[PDB]
Structure formats: structure tokens, C-alpha cells
A paper describes a structure:
The Ufd1/Npl4/Cdc48 complex is a crucial component of ubiquitin-mediated protein metabolism as the universal segregase that removes targets marked with polyubiquitin from complexes and membranes. It is composed of the Ufd1/Npl4 dimer adaptor, which determines substrate specificity, and the Cdc48 hexamer, a AAA+ protein that couples adenosine triphosphate (ATP) hydrolysis to protein unfolding. S. cerevisiae Ufd1/Npl4/Cdc48 was prepared and incubated in the presence of 1S1UH-mEOS and ATP·Mg and analyzed by single-particle cryo-electron microscopy. More than 700k particles from three datasets were combined and segregated by 3D classification into three major classes of the Ufd1/Npl4/Cdc48 complex: no ubiquitin nor substrate-bound (“substrate-unbound”), bound to substrate prior to unfolding (“substrate-interacting”), or bound to substrate and unfolding a ubiquitin (“ubiquitin-unfolded”).
In the substrate-unbound class, all D1 domains are bound to ATP and all D2 domains are bound to ADP. Other major differences observed between resolved substrate-interacting and ubiquitin-unfolded classes are the orientation of the tower relative to Cdc48 and the positioning of Npl4 residues 437 to 451, which forms a loop atop the Cdc48 central pore where substrate enters the hexamer during unfolding. In unbound and substrate-bound states, this loop is positioned over the central pore where it could clash with substrate as its being unfolded. In ubiquitin-unfolded states, the Npl4 tower appears perpendicular to the hexamer plane, but in unbound and substrate-bound states, the Ufd1/Npl4 tower tilts back and away from the Cdc48 central pore. Along with Npl4 residues 106 to 581, Ufd1 residues 228 to 256 and 281 to 311 are now resolved in our structures and form a tower atop the central pore of the Cdc48 hexamer. Interactions between SUMO and Ufd1 could not be resolved in EM maps, perhaps because the SIM is connected to Ufd1 through an extended and presumably disordered linker (last structured Ufd1 residue observed is amino acid 311; Ufd1 SIM is residues 357 to 361).
Author numbering:
A (entry chain B): 21 to 29, 71 to 75, 207 to 594, 608 to 719, 749 to 789
B (entry chain G): 107 to 386
C (entry chain C): 71 to 75, 206 to 594, 608 to 719, 749 to 790
């Protein structure tokens, strides 16, 4: 609504100077923020004089590499048409001793001399890393020079500084204060629509074959950053030319024009490129968008209503809470047998209020507990603040909360702004293992038990998992749902996967013999023969006893 | 493997390049080894050895020896490179065409096309090592001009270059005659139209080349006789005050830029003109 | 003619053998952009610029780069790491700048940055001002030349983790090539290449030498040839007059290297390729693995189908399984199963034994788990094999392994096989879905399997004609493959002892039945009955855990 009020309306005021807003896709909100912070102070400076404020200048973009930070900065600079001074981290740091400071001084001096200007300090983490990493005295001279130039600029006005870095913590803390890089923007991995837009942007000059399904590629590519999609397209084209190399004579200097005219990228080439590509964005904590509704989750209707009352009303109707003077709850804690669908509940909650989602699995928590990770709890919550509203899902919380890390989590959660919509949802299979400190009021104090699916819930789960897989017409799943009492969602997923495995084995055997385009009930029976409950009765009794204790203690 | 480019350079440069210039040393009393072999104190001394120069009271290293030192330090043979050219004259002008995503310098600039800070530092080598006047009359007449008129003077000196054995791989410019352009000398200085000077000097140089000479420097007089009865002059230029004022340094730099030294070890093909300036 | 016509500019594709896959990759990544730029103009793409080769030292990375450069006919600009880093302060950066500028000026060009791990070592390995200025200069040069030039950059390094991570992203060395140790045919080709000017004697059996050299990189083979020639010179030294400064041409004409010299050289060689994790080729079929037929079928339908028929998996919307976990008594033949699986899908093979994992746990190794999986990605399709996984999975190492298993691309053909003797002792986290979820029990061989093992182990030994092994196979109930191998080894030891005794007395060409009887007299089962009962109970519980 109002947030993207600046995006609504030759081209590019009419190399790397041709980049424009039409060369970007899937970052509408971040682009709106950057434009609102850059264009208005420069293009229309009289608004802030009329209303009587000094607009903030420092903007700090950060996200996984390849997300388009340099692209966004250059596009904004070229669309504004203002004196654009580009400073590269490594380029400044490669200079001799004493020159990497004079370069910064002259850069800022020139940017101040000329008309409304934009200074883009690309990779600022190179010239101002965290103090512990600033080894040497020149690494301190450069940081001090940067700080002095930043401080002495606040009076000048009509000059905006933009900086880009991979992680919020990678920068010296002194650079993130009032009169410095105060406004922060977080770039996350794009969603399906964003990936489709990027794919359309990149594949506009290729000789695509008519049998291309860019929507299918967008659906398949999950966790792919814009750079990953560009590499995907390049590798697909390389595969196409490799396939066509048979008709090409490498020895001859020139290739036949007719062959060059028959080049065409086919969907199979894109599938091969997907096979080869290796994204790395998800290796670190990132902000992602989710689109799970209250339909990928079966059952738990009472828990769904409880979650709605807990989260939706604070976000959608803050006025009522202000009227009654009651503040909303900060966090929730799911407990129950594994495979009951806690992550799906977290994603559904995030999608209901249309908030971003950050997930921190068990391995990440352990890696932070061992101090061998780039990020940290403070960094996670800084990203959550920058991307607010956000839902932070801490999975396998029992691994660390059996502590330094738990202390950091408590500090960050206590320091969270009450009115800022940043909810924290913890998941654990062993609620008694959780440290009692975390469960105090103002923390993950609202505990919710997630039970195993019931008959109708099992039927819904089985239908949902099998929807995108061909099956025998007139196939019944009621018997399978009924016979699997005590099975979690993971067990039903295993059953359907085994049925599919049997079907594919039969299909391959039939093709080799020379048929089986469905999944008949015999496959399901055979797969079910080797499937068993993954939750022991003792654990179920223990969870039921804990639930009974909680009910008795609260009534 | 690419090497030095095919470009004709002076005979003196070629014959200097042929030589090696090594300075042999005899068995030091600190050597521990038989007759055959050599450790560190008996190895031949490179022509650019700083200790040898400072011991012999030589203030610069005879440019050809500087080139030898650069070649020895860099450009491994048979591998490790494709012959990076060792010599490259400095250039401080801004890159008017960077287009790294920005318009030219006047309305945009990046860290790649921004001239870096300049660090002045005394040069450690000199192109021409000696300047030799064939006869005393050549400068006696030049000074007789001032003696008779009282104003200063200015003239180009013609000649040719040759070897100089008194310094390792050194060059001497031998001057045969001096030509004085039309200039308006004055009590405290002199002036001369640049256009007339160059227009006349073009044909004068053509004739001199036909005669075998070449233009190799400029000479001017800065004399102010003292009041003593004899013929004596004040020592205006000395250690604590200036040797060459700024204006004459600028003029000498312009003259050097206009007489490039064709060389075979630089991308442009020229480096540090062999043009000398003398003052009386 | 050839090569577009000692002097390293005289090397071509005919001087490299046994690396045709990586050679083809480098050629398609270098020649095509340079020789025929119009293809990418027609398709409207920018071909990738950087390429990063890595592998054990001595595997011929510099040789491959030189050969590709010479065959392309472009402007090769070899840059050394040690050579650049020996310059004074502020001079190495200038050399880098001048090299890149000259390469860009004379396009098309091929910049080869040899031993880049010395210019841009891992961020924790530099700790110096100059070591950071040089890295920043290299990054700036790489970024600047991304466009605006028809230039290709090639780099060589020992391991992926020995380079600054900033150099392995888009617009930089975004293509990886992994060089592994050659197989028997590759070693034969290398031997033929090297021993083409030598005065080989008639009795040379290069095939035999290739068979007897395992883990030998090309440098090792060159050293082997040099050592053999030196041994020949030593043997003929008796007729050489050291005092004289001349040697008769008659003696020189008599020089000739014989198989004995090559055997001596094999004896006196110190290969080091296998001391670190390395990608390698395997040639084990479903015939060396006697028995385990049901396990063979399970492995086939688990691994071969995803690799050979991905279209079916896409049709049914099923994601192929990542890895499996073998368990059972030691010596049951799990490594053979892993090698056979790798061979069937024609994939590479990376083996990580117990000592390597323990060394990583103690943090005193040059390779990490992330490095192993980077090599696996670069060499895909690959089979990673974690042997005796229970030593570490009794930890930060286990956490790293889980992280890497979660990270790996699903569509990538990288399969992780784990072997362990104590399935219960393994960390439960390793057995979750999306990880080594499948568990396979490898029992002791049966009578027919034992006889097959015995026959397989005796194909390289001169057994007595008309010999039988059914009695030995039946007598060894409960024995694993290792025990039967030990029985065969003891029989061979007795036979060779008797042969040596007979020769000294002076006959014994082949083993006899009594030798096997004597060897079996000392036979001992390596698995106690209690352990077998425990494994059977665990398997029965697992079957019950998968009941109706
Ligand atoms: N919407 C998009 N988001 C991200 N990248 C995009 C997008 N559309 C196209 N791209 C392409 O993806 C690549 C992104 O590279 P880019 O330099 O912007 O990444 P970066 O990691 O943010 O930058 P840097 O590290 O240089 O600051 C470029 O090829 C860009 O053309
Ligand atoms: N196919 C081959 N593979 C490997 N080495 C080979 C091959 N054919 C010949 N050789 C010999 O192996 C040696 C190759 O050593 P080389 O210097 O290329 O290896 P490297 O350790 O990868 O390189 P560098 O240290 O320069 O990065 C040379 O003796 C070469 O003659
Ligand atoms: N209502 C449901 N309850 C449980 N699992 C479900 C449900 N609907 C779908 N699933 C399946 O459960 C799996 C995810 O389980 P997950 O949310 O990770 O459980 P947990 O949080 O206990 O680990 C997916 O295969 C998903 O499709
Ligand atoms: N079918 C087989 N089962 C077991 N061992 C076998 C089999 N075939 C051959 N062997 C022998 O087993 C030995 C290797 O055993 P290995 O695979 O290391 O066992 P494990 O994996 O249990 O440690 C080799 O000497 C090999 O010849
Ligand atoms: Zn000596
Ligand atoms: Zn520029």
C-alpha cells in the first residue's frame, strides 16, 4: 500500500551504465525503500524543507552474495541521474600505504563539490571490518578516515552514501550509529514470482525453443539467487552448443551460418543445467518468503485458532490492543512428537500476516554453539529487525538448551522491541530438556502441544502429499488413512514415496523389456507392507502425561 | 615468446646493450674455498652495485645499468611470463574514457579511473652521465656575448652521444657547436617567441642532420658581476639556495618531453629523453 | 601442421594421457570462446571466464594448461605464484597489473595463474599487509576484466580450501575442474609418453608396470623412469672408466633398460598422492562381490535408476535417495560394494578412512569435510565413502557432516555411503530422512560365497592343477573374506618358504593341497559368536521395526 508509494508512476533519462529498473526483478519492497531513501532527498529536496526535517542519508544494504546489491545501487544511480562516485572495497585496499586514505578523502571531496551526488561504497566490509579483524595500523587509519568523512558530511546534504556488505556484523559497529549508516535494508532470496521475473529478464536475448516452461523452472528453482539463475541460463546455453558441436567443424575458422541459425535452447538443457548448478545461499541464514496457507496443514483446527488469536490480531488490529493497553505475546513454543508438522504451522503463521520467515535448524544452532559459523544470534535478530515483520523459527531448540548461546538468545529476546512485529517460535521434541529460563513471561512462555494426525487429518495429509503425482484413476486412500492410526506425516510421506519407488521400478522394467503411467493400489499395498509407526508407545505416553500435567497445572 | 619490439635506436644504445659491464673482484681474504669457485665476496660486482658507486663518489647509476638491473630482477627466461615490458614512463592524466558504469570524469568517476596519490622522490639514475665540450672557444664565445652586451643569453647546443668509460655503462654527450635563436635578453632575464624559435629550429635541425649533428641540450647564462675591481661574479646559486629555479626546471621538462629517447624496452617505445641543460 | 606450425611451447595434446575428461572440459571452456566467438554471439550469452583446476601435486595441471594454450594459438601469459611473491613491496601488485593489462591488450589471450594458493591463500593464512594488498589487487583485476575483453583466466591449486573464498563466486573462478589419480590405462599412456626416447630393452612389459603402479601420478612415473635408467647406468658402470673423460661408443651402444631396473625403481619410489583425500577411478563389477545378491539388487534399484533414468523420477515426482549406511561384522566386504556401485554408474570414488576422520577431528589435516564435498561436486557423479564412521559418530565433525549432507544439491549425482560395525553407537542425527536413512546389513558369506571368494583370490597364484576348494569353503563356516584371504596368504607363505628352501638346497612351481591344509590348521574366526548373535538380534529388531 503506502510502503511502495514511490514505485507507482523515454527510458533511463534517454556498458554497465545501461542498467535500469527494468533490469531488476523480485525485490519490489527493497527497491521501494532504496528509491524512497535516495531519490527524494536529491530529486525533490524541497519536501523535507517544507516539513522541516533532515532526511537520513546513510543506507546499508546487506544480503547473500549474488542477490543484486551492486545491480540495485547502479540502477538507482543511473535512474536518478546524479553525480555517481563508485568506491570499491578491494580497489581501495589494493593501494599502497597512505594512498588508500587519500583516495577516500578525494572521493568524498569531489562528491561534495559537484551537484547532488551518490557515493556507493561497494563491499564496505573490506575497508572497515570488525575491530577484531582490523589487524595492523593502516587498517585502523582507513577506518578512522571513513568515520571522519562520514561524520563531516551530515551538514552538506544533497549527497547520499550507499554501502553494501554480506552480513550486518561484518562491518565495524561504529559505522552504524546516528549520522552514519543508520537505515538498513535486507535483501532475501526471491520467491517463485521473483525467480520467474529474473528468468524472464535474463532469457530475453536467447534463442529459446518453443518448448520452454519458464514457470516450471521458477517452481523448481528454490533457494536460487539472481546470480544462480544467470549461471543456470549460461550453463543451459553451453549445453545446447555442446549438443550441437557434432554438426560443427572445430578445425575450420568459420562455422556454417545455417547451423548457427538452428541453435535453440530446449527444456532438457535447462533440466541439465539445474542438475549441474549448486546454489549456496541457504548455507547461511537468509530471509525467505513463504506461501503456506491453512490448507497444507491438516487438522489442528483448535491449534490453528489459537495461533490466529495469538499472532493475527496483534498484527492486523493493533488499534484494539492499544485501546485495551495490552501488549501482544512475543514468542510461542511448539512441543510434540517429531513429524507432526510444526514447521508447516510456523510457515502458515508467517504467511497469514504476510511476514518474512527466518529458519535456524539444529545444525546451525550447534555450529554457533561451537563458534564455527559466520553469523550469530545477534546477527539473526538484526536481520529480523531489518526485515520486520518477521517470524524467527528456532527448530531443534533442545540441542543447545539441554549456556552461552541460550544466554545470548535470552539477551536478544529481552532486548526486542515490544511494538515491532518480530515473533519467535521454538520447536522441541523434549520440552523438559528446555532450559526453564526461556519459558518465563516475556519469552517463549506460551507452550502448545502438537499431537499426531487423526483419521481425517491423515487422509488430508496423504492427499496433499500425493496431489502432484499421477495415480490410478478411481484410487481410494480412505483405507490407507484408516489403517495408519498413530502415524505422523513423515510416515505417510515415506509410504507414498515407497509406492512411487515401486511404480518407477515397474515402469523401468517394462521399458527395458521392450505401460505403467499410474500408481495402482497394489503398489500402495506393497509399500504399506514395509511401513511402521515411527513413534514408540512409551514416548506417546510420555507426551500425553506432559500434556495432562500442563492441563492440570493450568486449571 | 614475445620480446623487445623491433625499433631502431641510437648506435650508442645498441653498443651499450651488447656489453655486460660486470666488475670482477679478486680473491678476498675472507674467502673460504679453493681456487675454483666463489662464495659471496669474490663474485663479479654488478654494474649497478650501489656500494661501488658510493665508494667511487658517483651519485647516479648510468641508466643502461638501471635497465640491466631491471632485466636481471624480472623477466625469467623460458617460462614465468610473456615478457612484461620493464620500462614504462609515468602518466598522471586521468582516464577520460573509463565507462565502468559511469560517464566521463566531469560528471562521474570511480576508484579505477582516479589518479592515485603521487609520491615525489629523487631519481636514482641519469640518462646522460657526462657532457663534454670539444673546445673552450665554444663557451668562451657564448660568455663573450654577455661580456660585451651585459644581458643574459640562451642557445641550443648541437653534438652527438658516445660511450663514457669513467662510469659503468655511462654515456657522454659531446657538443660541437652552439646555435642561438632570436631572443630578447634582458638585465634580469630573457624572453623569446616560441613560434619563431621552433619554426627556425626545424630547418636548422634539418641542416644539422645533413651535417651529422643533433640537438642535445640548451645552455643559458645567469651572471651578475660583483663590484670588485677584477672580473668576478656573485655566487647566487649554491647549496642552501636554489640550483635551478622552478621556471627553468619547467622549461627543461618541456624540452625533454619534446625530444623523446627512442627505446626498445617500453610500450610506447620511448623513455626519458637524453636532453641536458647547462647553466653558467 | 599439428600444433599450428625443452621449449615448453612444444607441448601439445599428444603429450598428455589419461585425463581425457578434464582435458575435454578445459578445451570446451577455453577453445570455444576464443576460436569461435560467434557461437555465443548467436546464442546471446557471455561464456564463463574463470576456470580453477585442482588436484594432487604432480598430476600435470601446468602441463594441461600449457598444452591447451599452445593448441589454441592464443596469447599465453603464464604467471607464477612464488615468482610474483618474491618481489619487493609494491612490485608484485605492479606485476599482476602489467600482466593482466598486457593479456587484455593482445586479445584473444589466456592468463594462467600457476599456484594461485600462494597469491591468495585462505584469509587466516595471510595475516600480513602485503598478503592482503596482493589479494585485493587480484580481486580488482578479476572484476575489471569480467567484460570489456576476450580473455580467459586459468588457475591451478592443490585444494579448493587453500584459496580465498572471495575468488570462487560469480564473475570469478566459477568453474571448477578436479584432477584425480589415473587408472591403469592412464598410467600405461603416461609410461608410453615418457618411455619413447629411452633405449628400452626388448623385455619390457609396460602393461605390467601400469598394473603394478597404483596411486602413481604422472610425476611419480617420470621419477620411476629416471630411477630405472640410473639403475641401468649403475649396473653397466663396471665397464665405464671413471678416470677417462671419454667413453667408447661401443659401451654406450650396449645401454638398455630391462624389467629388473623397473622393478628396482618401483621398490625405491615414494608416492604420496594417497596421503590426502583424492578422487579416483574404480573398476569393480558385480562379480568380485560374491554373494549378497539381494543387497546387490537393492543397491541397483537405489543408485543406478536415479543416474540412468532421471526422466522416470521426474515423471513420478520422486527425489532420489542421498546415501545409505552399511553395517555388519568387519571384513564382510562393504568397500567392495561401494566400489561396485561407483563402477556401475561410471562415477568417481572418494574414500575417507577412519584415520583421516580422526585427524580431522583432531584438526591436524590439510583437508576438511567441506573440501571433500567440494571435490565430490567438482568430480560428479561421485561416490563418497565414509569408512568406520563410528569412530567420529560415537561432535563438531558430525555437525559439519550433517551440514554438508543437507547442503548438497538433490539433483547432483553424489551418493554418500557409510560403513560401521556398531550401528547403535552411531549418532541418531545421521539416520534422519534426507541423510543416511537407508540401513543395509551385510552378513557373513555363505558356502557358495566363500568358494567364490577363494576362487577370486587365487586368480593371481599358481595353484596346483586339479586342486579343489569346496572342502576349505565348507570347513570355514562363519569366516569373513579377510579370514579366507589370510588362509590363502598363509598357504602361499608356506609354499614360498618351501621353494626357497629347495632352491638353497640345490622345483616348486605351484602350491599343493598340503600347503592349504597346513595353512588352515591355524585358521581362526575373526568374529565371536556373541557378536554375531548381537548383529542378528539388531537385524531382527530392525525387521520388526519395519513390521505391519
Ligand atoms: N533481480 C536480480 N537480482 C539479482 N541479480 C540479478 C537480478 N536480475 C539480474 N541479476 C543478475 O545477477 C547478477 C547479480 O550480480 P551482482 O553484482 O548484482 O551481485 P552482488 O553479490 O549483490 O554484488 P557485489 O558483490 O558486486 O556487490 C548479475 O548478473 C545481475 O545481472
Ligand atoms: N598425462 C600426464 N599427467 C601428468 N603428468 C604428466 C603427464 N604426462 C607427462 N607428465 C609429466 O608429469 C610432470 C608434470 O608436472 P607438472 O609440473 O605439470 O605438475 P603440477 O604439480 O600439476 O604442476 P605445477 O607445480 O606447475 O602447478 C612432468 O614430468 C610431465 O612430463
Ligand atoms: N498436517 C500435517 N501434519 C504433519 N506433517 C504434515 C502435515 N501436512 C503435511 N505434512 C508433511 O510433514 C512433513 C514436514 O514435517 P515437519 O513440519 O518438518 O515436522 P516437524 O516440525 O515435527 O519436524 C512434510 O513432508 C509435509 O508435507
Ligand atoms: N564378497 C566379498 N565379501 C567380503 N570380502 C570380500 C569379498 N570379495 C572379496 N573380498 C575381500 O575382502 C577384502 C576387503 O574387505 P573389506 O571390503 O575391506 O571389508 P570391510 O568393508 O568389512 O572392512 C579384500 O581382500 C577382498 O579381496
Ligand atoms: Zn670467495
Ligand atoms: Zn571510472
Amino acid at each position: 500500500k503506502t510502503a511502495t508509494a514511490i514505485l507507482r508512476r523515454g527510458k533511463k533519462r534517454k556498458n554497465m551504465n545501461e542498467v535500469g529498473y527494468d533490469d531488476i526483478g523480485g525485490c519490489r519492497k527493497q527497491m521501494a525503500q532504496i528509491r524512497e531513501m535516495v531519490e527524494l532527498p536529491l530529486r525533490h529536496p524541497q519536501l523535507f524543507k517544507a516539513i522541516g526535517i533532515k532526511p537520513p542519508r546513510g543506507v546499508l544494504m546487506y544480503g547473500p552474495p549474488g542477490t543484486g546489491k551492486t545491480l540495485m545501487a547502479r540502477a538507482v544511480a543511473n535512474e536518478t541521474g546524479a553525480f555517481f562516485f563508485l568506491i570499491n572495497g578491494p580497489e581501495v585496499m589494493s593501494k599502497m600505504a597512505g594512498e588508500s586514505e587519500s583516495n577516500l578523502r578525494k572521493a568524498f571531496e569531489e562528491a561534495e563539490k559537484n551537484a547532488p551526488a551518490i557515493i556507493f561504497i561497494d563491499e564496505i566490509d573490506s575497508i572497515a571490518p570488525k575491530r577484531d579483524k582490523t589487524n595492523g595500523e593502516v587498517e585502523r587509519r582507513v577506518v578512522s578516515q571513513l568515520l571522519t568523512l562520514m561524520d563531516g558530511m551530515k551538514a552538506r546534504s544533497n549527497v547520499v552514501v550507499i554501502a553494501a556488505t554480506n552480513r550486518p556484523n561484518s562491518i565495524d559497529p561504529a559505522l552504524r550509529r546516528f549520522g552514519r549508516f543508520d537505515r538498513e535494508v535486507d535483501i532475501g532470496i526471491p520467491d517463485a514470482t521473483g525467480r520467474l521475473e529474473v528468468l524472464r529478464i535474463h532469457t530475453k536475448n536467447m534463442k529459446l525453443a518453443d518448448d520452454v516452461d519458464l514457470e516450471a523452472l521458477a517452481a523448481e528453482t528454490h533457494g536460487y539467487v539472481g546470480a544462480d539463475i544467470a549461471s543456470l541460463c549460461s550453463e543451459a546455453a553451453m549445453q545446447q552448443i555442446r549438443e550441437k558441436m557434432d554438426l560443427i567443424d572445430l578445425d575450420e575458422d568459420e562455422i556454417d551460418a545455417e547451423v548457427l541459425d538452428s541453435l535453440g535452447v530446449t527444456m532438457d538443457n535447462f533440466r541439465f543445467a539445474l542438475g549441474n548448478s549448486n546454489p549456496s545461499a541457504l548455507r547461511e541464514t537468509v530471509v525467505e518468503s513463504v506461501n503456506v496457507t491453512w490448507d497444507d496443514v491438516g487438522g489442528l483446527d483448535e491449534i490453528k485458532e489459537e495461533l490466529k488469536e495469538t499472532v493475527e490480531y496483534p498484527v492486523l488490529h493493533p488499534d484494539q490492543y492499544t485501546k485495551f493497553g495490552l501488549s501482544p505475546s512475543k514468542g510461542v513454543l511448539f512441543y510434540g512428537p517429531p513429524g507432526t508438522g510444526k514447521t508447516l504451522l510456523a510457515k502458515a503463521v508467517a504467511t497469514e500476516v504476510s511476514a518474512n520467515f527466518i529458519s535456524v535448524k539444529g545444525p546451525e544452532l550447534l555450529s554457533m554453539w561451537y563458534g564455527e559459523s559466520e553469523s550469530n544470534i545477534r546477527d539473526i535478530f538484526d536481520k529480523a529487525r531489518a526485515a520486520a515483520p518477521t517470524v524467527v523459527f528456532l527448530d531443534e531448540l533442545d540441542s543447545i538448551a539441554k549456556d552461552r548461546v541460550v544466554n545470548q538468545l535470552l539477551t536478544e529476546m529481552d532486548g526486542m522491541n515490544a511494538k515491532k512485529n518480530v515473533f519467535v517460535i521454538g520447536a522441541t521434541n523434549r520440552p523438559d530438556q528446555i532450559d526453564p529460563a526461556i519459558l518465563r513471561p516475556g519469552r517463549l512462555d506460551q507452550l502448545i502441544y502438537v499431537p499426531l494426525p487423526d483419521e481425517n487429518a491423515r487422509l488430508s495429509i496423504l492427499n496433499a502429499q500425493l496431489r502432484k503425482t499421477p495415480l490410478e484413476p478411481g484410487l481410494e486412500l480412505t483405507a490407507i488413512a484408516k489403517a495408519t492410526q498413530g502415524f505422523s506425516g513423515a510416515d505417510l510421506l515415506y509410504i507414498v514415496q515407497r509406492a512411487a519407488k515401486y511404480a518407477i521400478k515397474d515402469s523401468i522394467e517394462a521399458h527395458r523389456q521392450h505401460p505403467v503411467p499410474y500408481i495402482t493400489k497394489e503398489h500402495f499395498a506393497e509399500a504399506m507392507k514395509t511401513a511402521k509407526r515411527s513413534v514408540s508407545d512409551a514416548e506417546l505416553r510420555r507426551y500425553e502425561a506432559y500434556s495432562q500435567q500442563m492441563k492440570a497445572s493450568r486449571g | 615468446r614475445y620480446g623487445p619490439l623491433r625499433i631502431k635506436e641510437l648506435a650508442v644504445d645498441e653498443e651499450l646493450e651488447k656489453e655486460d659491464g660486470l666488475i670482477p673482484r679478486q680473491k678476498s681474504k675472507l674467502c673460504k674455498h679453493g681456487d675454483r669457485g666463489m662464495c659471496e665476496y669474490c663474485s663479479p660486482l654488478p654494474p649497478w652495485d650501489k656500494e661501488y658507486h658510493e665508494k667511487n663518489k658517483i651519485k647516479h647509476i648510468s641508466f643502461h645499468s638501471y635497465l640491466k638491473k631491471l632485466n636481471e630482477n624480472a623477466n625469467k627466461k623460458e617460462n614465468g611470463s610473456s615478457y612484461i615490458s620493464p620500462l614504462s614512463e609515468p602518466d598522471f592524466r586521468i582516464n577520460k574514457r573509463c565507462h565502468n558504469g559511469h560517464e566521463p570524469w566531469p560528471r562521474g568517476i570511480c576508484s579505477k579511473c582516479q589518479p592515485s596519490a603521487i609520491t615525489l622522490q629523487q631519481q636514482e639514475f641519469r640518462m646522460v652521465d657526462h657532457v663534454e665540450f670539444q673546445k673552450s672557444e665554444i663557451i668562451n664565445e657564448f660568455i663573450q656575448a654577455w661580456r660585451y652586451t651585459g644581458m643574459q643569453r640562451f642557445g641550443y647546443m648541437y653534438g652527438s652521444y658516445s660511450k663514457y668509460d669513467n662510469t659503468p655503462l655511462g654515456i657522454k654527450a659531446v657538443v660541437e657547436a652552439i646555435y642561438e635563436p632570436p631572443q630578447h635578453d634582458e638585465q634580469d632575464g630573457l624572453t623569446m617567441d616560441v613560434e619563431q624559435v621552433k619554426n627556425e629550429m626545424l630547418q636548422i635541425d634539418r641542416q644539422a642532420q645533413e651535417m651529422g649533428l643533433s640537438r642535445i641540450g640548451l645552455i643559458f647564462t645567469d651572471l651578475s658581476d660583483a663590484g670588485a675591481g677584477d672580473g668576478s661574479v656573485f655566487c647566487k646559486r649554491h647549496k642552501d639556495s636554489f640550483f635551478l629555479s622552478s621556471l627553468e626546471v619547467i622549461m627543461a621538462a618541456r624540452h625533454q618531453t619534446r625530444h623523446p629517447n627512442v627505446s626498445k624496452y617500453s610500450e610506447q617505445g620511448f623513455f626519458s629523453s637524453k636532453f641536458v641543460t647547462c647553466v653558467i
